[PDB]
Design an enzyme around this catalytic site. Structure first.
Site, PDB file in Angstrom:
ATOM      1  N   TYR A   1       0.853  -1.180   0.000  1.00 38.99           N
ATOM      2  CA  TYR A   1       0.000   0.000   0.000  1.00 38.99           C
ATOM      3  C   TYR A   1       0.892   1.235   0.000  1.00 38.99           C
ATOM      4  O   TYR A   1       0.845   2.046  -0.931  1.00 38.99           O
ATOM      5  CB  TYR A   1      -0.946   0.003   1.203  1.00 38.99           C
ATOM      6  CG  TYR A   1      -1.874   1.198   1.233  1.00 38.99           C
ATOM      7  CD1 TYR A   1      -3.016   1.234   0.444  1.00 38.99           C
ATOM      8  CD2 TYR A   1      -1.606   2.289   2.045  1.00 38.99           C
ATOM      9  CE1 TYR A   1      -3.864   2.323   0.465  1.00 38.99           C
ATOM     10  CE2 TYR A   1      -2.450   3.383   2.074  1.00 38.99           C
ATOM     11  CZ  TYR A   1      -3.577   3.393   1.282  1.00 38.99           C
ATOM     12  OH  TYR A   1      -4.421   4.481   1.309  1.00 38.99           O
TER      13      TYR A   1
ATOM     14  N   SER B   1      -5.636   0.623  -4.679  1.00 38.37           N
ATOM     15  CA  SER B   1      -5.698   2.070  -4.448  1.00 38.37           C
ATOM     16  C   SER B   1      -4.263   2.592  -4.433  1.00 38.37           C
ATOM     17  O   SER B   1      -3.507   2.304  -5.376  1.00 38.37           O
ATOM     18  CB  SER B   1      -6.507   2.331  -3.187  1.00 38.37           C
ATOM     19  OG  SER B   1      -6.398   3.683  -2.787  1.00 38.37           O
ATOM     20  N   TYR B   2      -3.843   3.342  -3.410  1.00 40.85           N
ATOM     21  CA  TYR B   2      -2.468   3.827  -3.354  1.00 40.85           C
ATOM     22  C   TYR B   2      -1.476   2.697  -3.605  1.00 40.85           C
ATOM     23  O   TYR B   2      -0.458   2.890  -4.281  1.00 40.85           O
ATOM     24  CB  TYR B   2      -2.198   4.482  -1.998  1.00 40.85           C
ATOM     25  CG  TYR B   2      -1.025   5.439  -1.989  1.00 40.85           C
ATOM     26  CD1 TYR B   2       0.281   4.974  -2.085  1.00 40.85           C
ATOM     27  CD2 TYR B   2      -1.224   6.809  -1.869  1.00 40.85           C
ATOM     28  CE1 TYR B   2       1.354   5.845  -2.071  1.00 40.85           C
ATOM     29  CE2 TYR B   2      -0.157   7.688  -1.852  1.00 40.85           C
ATOM     30  CZ  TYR B   2       1.129   7.201  -1.954  1.00 40.85           C
ATOM     31  OH  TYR B   2       2.194   8.071  -1.938  1.00 40.85           O
TER      32      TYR B   2
ATOM     33  N   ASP C   1     -16.163   4.172  -9.952  1.00 40.30           N
ATOM     34  CA  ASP C   1     -15.270   4.599  -8.884  1.00 40.30           C
ATOM     35  C   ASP C   1     -15.307   6.119  -8.772  1.00 40.30           C
ATOM     36  O   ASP C   1     -14.914   6.827  -9.706  1.00 40.30           O
ATOM     37  CB  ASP C   1     -13.850   4.103  -9.147  1.00 40.30           C
ATOM     38  CG  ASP C   1     -12.957   4.211  -7.925  1.00 40.30           C
ATOM     39  OD1 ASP C   1     -13.034   5.238  -7.214  1.00 40.30           O
ATOM     40  OD2 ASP C   1     -12.179   3.265  -7.676  1.00 40.30           O
TER      41      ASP C   1
ATOM     42  N   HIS D   1     -14.793   2.303  -5.757  1.00 39.69           N
ATOM     43  CA  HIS D   1     -13.436   2.070  -5.281  1.00 39.69           C
ATOM     44  C   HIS D   1     -13.331   0.888  -4.328  1.00 39.69           C
ATOM     45  O   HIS D   1     -12.212   0.452  -4.034  1.00 39.69           O
ATOM     46  CB  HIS D   1     -12.894   3.323  -4.596  1.00 39.69           C
ATOM     47  CG  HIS D   1     -11.419   3.280  -4.359  1.00 39.69           C
ATOM     48  ND1 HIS D   1     -10.828   3.814  -3.236  1.00 39.69           N
ATOM     49  CD2 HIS D   1     -10.413   2.761  -5.102  1.00 39.69           C
ATOM     50  CE1 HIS D   1      -9.522   3.623  -3.296  1.00 39.69           C
ATOM     51  NE2 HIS D   1      -9.244   2.990  -4.420  1.00 39.69           N
TER      52      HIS D   1
HETATM   53  N1  LIG Z   1      -8.555   9.310   0.649  1.00 39.69           N
HETATM   54  C1  LIG Z   1      -7.774   8.509   1.580  1.00 39.69           C
HETATM   55  C2  LIG Z   1      -8.348   8.676   2.984  1.00 39.69           C
HETATM   56  C3  LIG Z   1      -7.407   8.024   3.988  1.00 39.69           C
HETATM   57  O1  LIG Z   1      -6.414   7.498   3.607  1.00 39.69           O
HETATM   58  N2  LIG Z   1      -7.697   8.016   5.408  1.00 39.69           N
HETATM   59  C4  LIG Z   1      -6.728   7.376   6.285  1.00 39.69           C
HETATM   60  C5  LIG Z   1      -7.298   6.835   7.572  1.00 39.69           C
HETATM   61  N3  LIG Z   1      -8.008   7.912   8.243  1.00 39.69           N
HETATM   62  C6  LIG Z   1      -8.811   8.824   7.451  1.00 39.69           C
HETATM   63  O2  LIG Z   1      -9.394   9.711   7.980  1.00 39.69           O
HETATM   64  C7  LIG Z   1      -8.902   8.649   5.933  1.00 39.69           C
HETATM   65  C8  LIG Z   1      -7.825   7.036   1.164  1.00 39.69           C
HETATM   66  C9  LIG Z   1      -7.363   6.897  -0.287  1.00 39.69           C
HETATM   67  C10 LIG Z   1      -6.102   7.337  -0.664  1.00 39.69           C
HETATM   68  C11 LIG Z   1      -5.681   7.208  -1.976  1.00 39.69           C
HETATM   69  F1  LIG Z   1      -4.442   7.643  -2.346  1.00 39.69           F
HETATM   70  C12 LIG Z   1      -6.519   6.634  -2.916  1.00 39.69           C
HETATM   71  F2  LIG Z   1      -6.113   6.502  -4.212  1.00 39.69           F
HETATM   72  C13 LIG Z   1      -7.775   6.195  -2.536  1.00 39.69           C
HETATM   73  C14 LIG Z   1      -8.197   6.320  -1.227  1.00 39.69           C
HETATM   74  F3  LIG Z   1      -9.435   5.882  -0.859  1.00 39.69           F
HETATM   75  N1  LIG Z   2      -7.521   4.452   4.328  1.00 42.64           N
HETATM   76  C1  LIG Z   2      -7.941   3.061   4.279  1.00 42.64           C
HETATM   77  C2  LIG Z   2      -6.738   2.237   3.789  1.00 42.64           C
HETATM   78  C3  LIG Z   2      -6.964   0.722   3.923  1.00 42.64           C
HETATM   79  O1  LIG Z   2      -7.176   0.253   4.991  1.00 42.64           O
HETATM   80  N2  LIG Z   2      -6.915  -0.189   2.787  1.00 42.64           N
HETATM   81  C4  LIG Z   2      -6.665   0.278   1.428  1.00 42.64           C
HETATM   82  C5  LIG Z   2      -6.888  -0.787   0.349  1.00 42.64           C
HETATM   83  N3  LIG Z   2      -8.060  -1.583   0.653  1.00 42.64           N
HETATM   84  C6  LIG Z   2      -8.225  -2.033   2.018  1.00 42.64           C
HETATM   85  O2  LIG Z   2      -9.159  -2.677   2.358  1.00 42.64           O
HETATM   86  C7  LIG Z   2      -7.149  -1.609   3.011  1.00 42.64           C
HETATM   87  C8  LIG Z   2      -8.427   2.559   5.652  1.00 42.64           C
HETATM   88  C9  LIG Z   2      -9.075   3.599   6.580  1.00 42.64           C
HETATM   89  C10 LIG Z   2      -8.763   3.527   7.931  1.00 42.64           C
HETATM   90  C11 LIG Z   2      -9.317   4.423   8.829  1.00 42.64           C
HETATM   91  F1  LIG Z   2      -8.995   4.347  10.151  1.00 42.64           F
HETATM   92  C12 LIG Z   2     -10.197   5.395   8.381  1.00 42.64           C
HETATM   93  F2  LIG Z   2     -10.745   6.281   9.263  1.00 42.64           F
HETATM   94  C13 LIG Z   2     -10.519   5.467   7.034  1.00 42.64           C
HETATM   95  C14 LIG Z   2      -9.965   4.569   6.136  1.00 42.64           C
HETATM   96  F3  LIG Z   2     -10.292   4.655   4.812  1.00 42.64           F
END
Ligand SMILES: N[C@@H](CC(=O)N1CCNC(=O)C1)Cc1cc(F)c(F)cc1F
Ligand SMILES: N[C@@H](CC(=O)N1CCNC(=O)C1)Cc1cc(F)c(F)cc1F
Ligand SMILES: N[C@@H](CC(=O)N1CCNC(=O)C1)Cc1cc(F)c(F)cc1F
Ligand SMILES: N[C@@H](CC(=O)N1CCNC(=O)C1)Cc1cc(F)c(F)cc1F
Lengths: 726, 728
Positions: B509, B592-593, B670, B702
């Site tokens: 990731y 995703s990332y 998405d 997504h």
């Molecule tokens: N937008 C991002 C939100 C996030 O990472 N968090 C972290 C955990 N706590 C939070 O409040 C939200 C997730 C994200 C990143 C990408 F680069 C991408 F391509 C798609 C995604 F969905």
């Molecule tokens: N940022 C997200 C990244 C993640 O867990 N991934 C990305 C790829 N697919 C998956 O299932 C695993 C998780 C997340 C955690 C938080 F605590 C939050 F508040 C918001 C979030 F979105």
């Protein structure tokens, strides 16, 4: 070394054409180097008409030229921008051949949708911003004929999407009178026509994807409306605005939704119109002649010519084109006779009974020339081969003295002919598309004498001697005692002892023909040459040029008989001893992609793998003029229940037995990406694995230099993988 | 155990993991669903009654998706007709049920298509959002009060967050904040008027003749962001004739000079609320502490009570400024902030004293404050055994910071080194949620003496069915790169041996403040690849990973696509030289990332991986939303960081994909990382003539979380892996 995929994708062995433009009855232009020549057909000598340096210091690049009929002006086409299949927009510069300068004052506007000369002289009419402008002289200000031009709504002088794609096969909705006098045009109103919306991602730097929106009438949706107008050019006013007399449609057409399908000028004051109804099985031929009194166009109800059908739809893809005599009192029109074969009939403007001048178990393709003593036409009558083409000349004073002008010239390497006549049919050029290398000869019509060979592809022929080229067998099989035709691209040094993998190249569309005597260098050439793959095609029910008995078999039954015959054909191809029945693939494009998909879901175990490019998945998704022509209307009172029966999604479960490859363009204005989107989703909901591949911002052609190379390199591996080839 | 954990056991979910998700209704009891029935358990002795039976709404005629009891217990909110929108957002239909009458409330029912609903923290005051307008319902059967009057679809968001504030800021659809007593209802207002619109096609069931076009206010990197104003209303003084006066709390002058966000809202006391503001350049946050004027009915924010939190080496916070935890009197708060050494520890603040004093310190980080009492502060941290991938609950005395005592480190250090906790109302008890490394274990403890009362769930049933299965073992270790300790993990196939060479898959990731290497126990695709196909699924957490300090997390600051991509290649090179890892069969796949890193890694031309799978990847950072992208990239302008924005695209490496086998997967619907991104990736690959495998998913977003689509993608990815690793 054989014919490789790199050869096909890079055009290594290029066929030679002979593009000539008859300017008179005995002189035709030819494209030499970049210079323009003028050949004298009678003597075979030429004289330079324009050096390739006249536009040396031009500043742009001409895509196409257009000499005025008289020869006093030449129109230049540059800044080409493609739109749909036939439509496009570009820039234009007029060159004064006499002054030897370039018109600068009152230049044609840029982004012009269509332009064309008058038949004689130098009168000029063009469509810009959906409106018609006429320039009597290149340097004079243009007159505005129409003022209702409106983007994506009002089309004056140009056809909308469905009319361009399904009817006229051209962006041009203009029609000049035989001489520079009248200008006829249609007006299409897409106000209440629904819009198709798909995303366009453009270049990498387009941050927000643009959404393309096109007035696209789907099956049973609200169709555009058409109005016909005629206006006189030798009376335009620079003070007051030009008046266009509207020609309306007969009451038999106004009773419901209808289209306009053909426009042909009989004489200088007579114009022929053909109207088609929504449920396209009843045509109407309105013949209109000008009235010097009220300045109107009156169409004698005493001159109509109804043309209906019972076994299916009227016309092959549209009612035929009339060929009026020099006086405009008798014309010739290809229609299907009593037994169901399309032959040349002879009409009288006053007599509603036409008299067929040809008949047999074949069909007349087209009518290429009409003189005083002989009518010229193309037909598949030679040796009872529908996939063949030859030119026959029939005597008007005796419907029995028919002479073939091409059956015997070179019967070995020429069985598929085309012809282009001079202005007064004094000479004619013959194109020999196959089965051998193309051949171009010149002839004189007086005694059908052969003058010389304009091009024989001898330069190309010299190269293929060292490469292992595939052979092409054209034959037939029997289904229900009826004779259906097929072709096989046989690999080089074909041995009936060895087992070969067979690839079924299929289209199977209404009035289609994949089995012919045409020589071609395509992707199937590499497959048989390099990969030793028997790629074959089959013309089952629905295929045209064989009578309405076979063509109209799938009327209101799309995705049935044409699908079964393909399966049945491959079933019998699998018992030939030289066909490895364990490796029989199938692939199709456009309609062929729909049949290929309908085949892989049939659940017959005949095919192992398949490829469907830009396929139809649900007939309610495609446009109305084409879909309704064969299926009817998606209503429970018409044929809705078969619309729902012929979907490929309802046949997903059976995809578990075969390998599938679905390919589509994300910008396909024709067969929307929605079609394949629904296919993949249906396969997902039943747990069917498959291969897929989208092409960003590609249309139904996928003709980009990179995209074209990519899709054929992609499918080639899928085939080599399926057949277990290195 | 002759049987192995197969893909069918994962997709069909044969071996299911049990939980114990309770709901503390007070400091003494909680609710927990038994067998379609909602029960009430007594934390003191474990006895239980029944709050609601399965045969209560059995004839309600609606498939109830969720319930919602009131704090007091006089009404219960029923949620049916659930309609998912984005990640956290949705619109459902609601019905109130009077417990003291056992009758569904019908007078002035809550409208359908309601976007958000919630009671007051105490009592039964109700506030919901309909058509982007806030409504206050004092009594569950009396008419509602029209708080806001500017509701407008895709334009004005009252009480609900727009797409950006829902995904990147609050991580919630709710923009409502009750006061503890419920007297004041704080809310925010968002305005996406000038925000551009993302437009993609939706195809729907077969029966939809024309594809629908979805348009969503979505600010990409550089575009204008939505504007936010904050308001508070007194739910008591409801006039119902002149309706309500929404007192507005203006943002600080330090913020109003330019683009800024509203990043946090925390109530301190019954009349004091703390608002944290964030600027466009996410490195300068300002907390405002405002008191309710009882004379003028206003809300003033004294500058003395205003606290500045900035960062020089990167963005402030892990993903947003930390939430404050105020005391009883509301004159001081404990908050997580970065040390001067670069680590995130708890600091003790005072309302009118800027210099805070850290109550914790060390080469570890505080994950979060879980409960705050008058003498102890319970928190989670990756301190124990110095493992950044571990989680334990700690108890620190507020009068002596040497009184640091861990409550979960020693319970069972064998099967538990990653703990989650849920406290009561006043933290009389706390449930421990041990997620790994062993089977999950749920227990209950009493804070008064910190003794284990009873085991809630040990997943003994799961342990009984894994007997006849060849489970994979998980190893957690670290390598060293340039004097720094970076952690990784591997899912070793059963019966692991060094005498053989195994195909290794690098699950990645690598996002900012991410961590794919931990101790959690999971049953997923990686378990099947190791158990059945004998593939070593490995992950790495280096350069950009969180919870290891700012010097590692703020390394990729304004430089995405270089450190994350480089370390994954470095780690894969390290693992390829261990001995038991085969060089001929090394892959990498990310979602995703991780899909952006997977593509960047393959496009690097480093020549390490035979194949690679990218699922919903990012192409260029101009395509992704602003708040997330600009937090790590600044603005895409020449005077900021536009040059790197352009040198970090995956399309600019299409030439290097000729060596590796590529599989690109992306959902059609998405809305987070638009299909546009993958479309540009494939177009770049086509323009340079490089073959690759592709797979779109119609109407999938997504998540690709559909029942049929989830099984389909992993089935397709399993074939792509099995053929690239030549596995039977
Ligand atoms: N937008 C991002 C939100 C996030 O990472 N968090 C972290 C955990 N706590 C939070 O409040 C939200 C997730 C994200 C990143 C990408 F680069 C991408 F391509 C798609 C995604 F969905
Ligand atoms: N940022 C997200 C990244 C993640 O867990 N991934 C990305 C790829 N697919 C998956 O299932 C695993 C998780 C997340 C955690 C938080 F605590 C939050 F508040 C918001 C979030 F979105
Ligand atoms: N109808 C067209 C058939 C086609 O598109 N094919 C056939 C073979 N395989 C394919 O994928 C594409 C040809 C055609 C189109 C016109 F518009 C027209 F005016 C005249 C034409 F002959
Ligand atoms: N719309 C069709 C037009 C056509 O076939 N002709 C025949 C030759 N002469 C003409 O005037 C135009 C082609 C077509 C059919 C499909 F089923 C499809 F999926 C995609 C397509 F492009």
């Amino acid at each position: 070394k054989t014919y490789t995929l790199t050869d096909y994708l890079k055009n290594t062995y290029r066929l030679k054409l002979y593009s000539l433009r008859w300017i008179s009855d005995h002189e035709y232009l030819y494209k030499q180097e970049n210079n323009i020549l003028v050949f004298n057909a009678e003597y075979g000598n030429s004289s330079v008409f324009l050096e390739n340096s006249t536009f040396d210091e031009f500043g742009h690049s001409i895509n196409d030229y257009s000499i005025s009929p008289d020869g006093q002006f030449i129109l230049l086409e540059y800044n080409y921008v493609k739109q749909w299949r036939h439509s496009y927009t570009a820039s234009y510069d007029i060159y004064d051949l006499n002054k030897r300068q370039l018109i600068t004052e009152e230049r044609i506007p840029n982004n012009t949708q269509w332009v064309t000369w008058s038949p004689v002289g130098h009168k000029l009419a063009y469509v810009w911003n959906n409106d018609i402008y006429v320039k009597i002289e290149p340097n004079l200000p243009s007159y505005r004929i129409t003022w209702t031009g409106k983007e994506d709504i009002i089309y004056n002088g140009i056809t909308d999407w469905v009319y361009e794609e399904e009817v006229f096969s051209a962006y041009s909705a203009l029609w000049w009178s035989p001489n520079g006098t009248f200008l006829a045009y249609a007006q299409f109103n897409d106000t209440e026509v629904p819009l198709i919306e798909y995303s366009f991602y453009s270049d990498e730097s387009l941050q927000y994807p643009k959404t393309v929106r096109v007035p696209y009438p789907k099956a049973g949706a609200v169709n555009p409306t058409v109005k016909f107008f005629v206006v006189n050019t030798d009376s335009l006013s620079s003070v007051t605005n030009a008046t266009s007399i509207q020609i309306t449609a007969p009451a038999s057409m106004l009773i419901g939704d209808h289209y306009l399908c053909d426009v042909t000028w009989a004489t200088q004051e007579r114009i022929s119109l053909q109207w088609l109804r929504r449920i396209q099985n009843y045509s109407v031929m309105d013949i209109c002649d000008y009235d010097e009194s009220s300045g109107r166009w009156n169409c004698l109800v005493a001159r109509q010519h109804i043309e209906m059908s019972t076994t299916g739809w009227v016309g092959r893809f549209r009612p035929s084109e009339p060929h009026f005599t020099l006086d405009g009192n008798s014309f010739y029109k290809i229609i299907s006779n009593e037994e169901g074969y399309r032959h040349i009939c002879y009409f009288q403007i006053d007599k509603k009974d036409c008299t067929f001048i040809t008949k047999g178990t074949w069909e007349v393709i087209g009518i290429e020339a009409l003189t005083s003593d002989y009518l010229y036409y193309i037909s598949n009558e030679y040796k009872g081969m529908p996939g063949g083409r030859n030119l026959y000349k029939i005597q008007l004073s005796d419907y029995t003295k028919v002479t073939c002008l091409s059956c015997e010239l070179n019967p070995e390497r020429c069985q598929y002919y085309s012809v282009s006549f001079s202005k007064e049919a004094k000479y004619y050029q013959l194109r020999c598309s196959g089965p051998g290398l193309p051949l171009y000869t010149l002839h004189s019509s007086v005694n059908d004498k052969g003058l010389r060979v304009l091009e024989d592809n001898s330069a190309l022929d010299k190269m293929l001697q060292n490469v292992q080229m595939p052979s092409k067998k054209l034959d037939f099989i029997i289904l229900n005692e009826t004779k259906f035709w097929y072709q096989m691209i046989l690999p080089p040094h074909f041995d009936k002892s060895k087992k070969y993998p067979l690839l079924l190249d299929v289209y199977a569309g209404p009035c289609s023909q994949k089995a012919d005597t045409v020589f071609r260098l395509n992707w199937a050439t590499y497959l048989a040459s390099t990969e030793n793959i028997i790629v074959a095609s089959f013309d089952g029910r629905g295929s045209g040029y064989q009578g309405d008995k076979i063509m109209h078999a799938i009327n209101r039954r799309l995705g049935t008989f044409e699908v079964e015959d393909q399966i049945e054909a491959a079933r019998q191809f699998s018992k030939m001893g030289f066909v490895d029945n364990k490796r029989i693939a199938i692939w199709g494009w456009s309609y062929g992609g729909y049949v290929t998909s309908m085949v892989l879901g049939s659940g017959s175990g005949v095919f192992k793998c398949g490829i469907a490019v830009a396929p139809v998945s649900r007939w309610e998704y495609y446009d109305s003029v084409y879909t309704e022509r064969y299926m009817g209307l998606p209503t429970p009172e018409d044929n809705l229940d078969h619309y729902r029966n012929s979907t490929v999604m309802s046949r997903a479960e059976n995809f578990k037995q075969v390998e599938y490859l679905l390919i589509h363009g994300t910008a396909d204005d024709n067969v929307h990406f929605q079609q394949s989107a629904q296919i993949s989703k249906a396969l997902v909901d039943v747990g069917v694995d498959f291969q897929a591949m989208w092409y960003t911002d590609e249309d139904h052609g996928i003709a980009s230099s990179t995209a074209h190379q990519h899709i054929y390199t992609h499918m080639s591996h899928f085939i080599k993988q399926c057949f277990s080839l290195p």
